[PDB]
Design a protein around this ligand. Structure first.
Ligand SMILES: C[C@@H](Oc1cc(-n2cnc3ccccc32)sc1C(N)=O)c1ccccc1C(F)(F)F
Ligand SMILES: [Cl-]
Ligand SMILES: [Cl-]
Ligand SMILES: [Cl-]
Ligand SMILES: [Cl-]
Ligand SMILES: [Cl-]
Length: 251
């Protein structure tokens, strides 16, 4: 639990700085998030301490794992140490498919659907945005939900979270994410949020590309029902014949 115990390999991204690191003792590959709390109030640091302790409370194969926290009071820097996911985030995968003009395999979409649905179920059980930038791939085809720790348009904003949220709002968002994985675009696009809001209330979107089975289109479509009570539950999603053992996590 000391900075010197790890060695930085290189910076991945720059609230702070994310770095790929190696634990000296066993040579394990990890990452840490680098935060400068130097300018924080005692209050802001109090909320940060309790947010970080909530990261520690969740151990699930489909949720990005927390390992450690290092305080360096000399540089007023705080490091959050977590799982390295070698395949990166889903935003990149989607962007890479848009440009290489190549759609993702149904088998891949089935993996994301199964494993995100299980990550969700685990979150609800303890009572995290479901956007592509916060979903990660490890080296073995496993999917992991991370956590995020005005300009943007809220493509995944559910009908109910628009007209003032429950567990079925999470299902809508999962619907929007699987949809974008399939079509390489969100179900509802627009230039403003008022336009967006317009399209969402009509509840109309294009069928996902025809290379995807009717079965996969059906389930994604159900998640995007305007009525939360017509959207399938976590349990009803996993009961779907499409979802097979090999779509689940594997060590
Ligand atoms: C800001 C950042 O937050 C992250 C980065 C995580 N991470 C773990 N292994 C990775 C391999 C490649 C890229 C990122 C990886 S997890 C995590 C979190 N707590 O949500 C982030 C978020 C999305 C995409 C990229 C980045 C990064 F570049 F800043 F790392
Ligand atoms: Cl796993
Ligand atoms: Cl394409
Ligand atoms: Cl309709
Ligand atoms: Cl189409
Ligand atoms: Cl549910």
């Amino acid at each position: 639990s000391r900075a010197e115990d790890y060695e930085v390999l290189y910076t991945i991204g720059t609230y702070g700085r994310c770095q790929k690191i190696r634990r000296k003792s066993d040579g394990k590959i990890l990452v840490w998030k680098e935060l400068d709390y130097g300018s924080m109030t005692e209050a802001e640091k109090q909320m940060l301490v309790s947010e970080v302790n909530l990261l520690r409370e969740l151990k699930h194969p489909n949720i990005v794992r927390y390992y450690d926290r290092i305080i360096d009071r000399t540089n007023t820097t705080l490091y959050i140490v977590m799982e390295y996911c070698e395949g990166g985030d889903l935003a990149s995968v989607i962007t890479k498919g848009t440009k290489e003009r190549q759609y993702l395999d149904e088998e891949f979409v089935l993996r994301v659907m199964t494993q995100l649905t299980l990550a969700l179920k685990e979150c609800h059980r303890r009572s995290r945005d479901l956007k592509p930038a916060n979903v990660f791939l490890d080296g073995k085809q496993n999917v992991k939900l991370g956590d995020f720790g005005f300009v943007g348009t809220p493509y995944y904003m559910s009908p109910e979270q628009m007209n003032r949220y429950n567990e079925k709002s999470d299902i809508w968002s999962l619907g929007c994410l699987l949809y974008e994985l399939c079509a390489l675009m969100p179900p509802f696009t627009a230039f403003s949020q008022k336009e967006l809001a317009g399209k969402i209330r009509e509840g109309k979107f294009r069928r996902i590309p025809y290379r995807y089975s009717d079965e996969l289109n059906e389930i994604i479509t159900r998640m995007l029902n305007l009525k939360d009570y017509h959207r399938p539950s976590v349990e009803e999603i996993l009961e779907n014949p499409l979802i097979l053992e090999h779509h689940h996590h594997h060590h």
